[PDB]
């Protein structure tokens, strides 16, 4: 995954 995609994964799992 890219830098943005690693940051997107974090945001999409934040409750």
């Amino acid at each position, epitope marked *: 995954p890219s*830098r*943005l*995609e690693e*940051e*997107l*994964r974090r*945001r999409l799992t*934040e409750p």
Partner: nanobody
Amino acid sequence: VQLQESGGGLVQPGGSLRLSCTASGVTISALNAMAMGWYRQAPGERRVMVAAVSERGNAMYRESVQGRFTVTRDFTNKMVSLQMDNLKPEDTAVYYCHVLEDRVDSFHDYWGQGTQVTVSS
């Protein structure tokens, strides 16, 4: 980056709704290097990200909406859309168009206006 949502409003449980969003004040080449996506917020919750298309064209989803929500990005026309199928009462929220910029040391959030989606029998 200026973002504007179209669509919203009332749907019955199990129903479908499409939101769209256009970006302006940004070139195609600049916006290509950014992510585009969608957040939602119900009263008494924080804004949380539900779907995005990365700068590499990869759609990504929150588990609670995967399969039901489809996010699509038109790079050429600087648009992102959220097709919401099989909607549930707990999908009721204000939905925000969002762009994520990598500013190297930090990330920058660009926000749309928000549009209410209401799921009611």
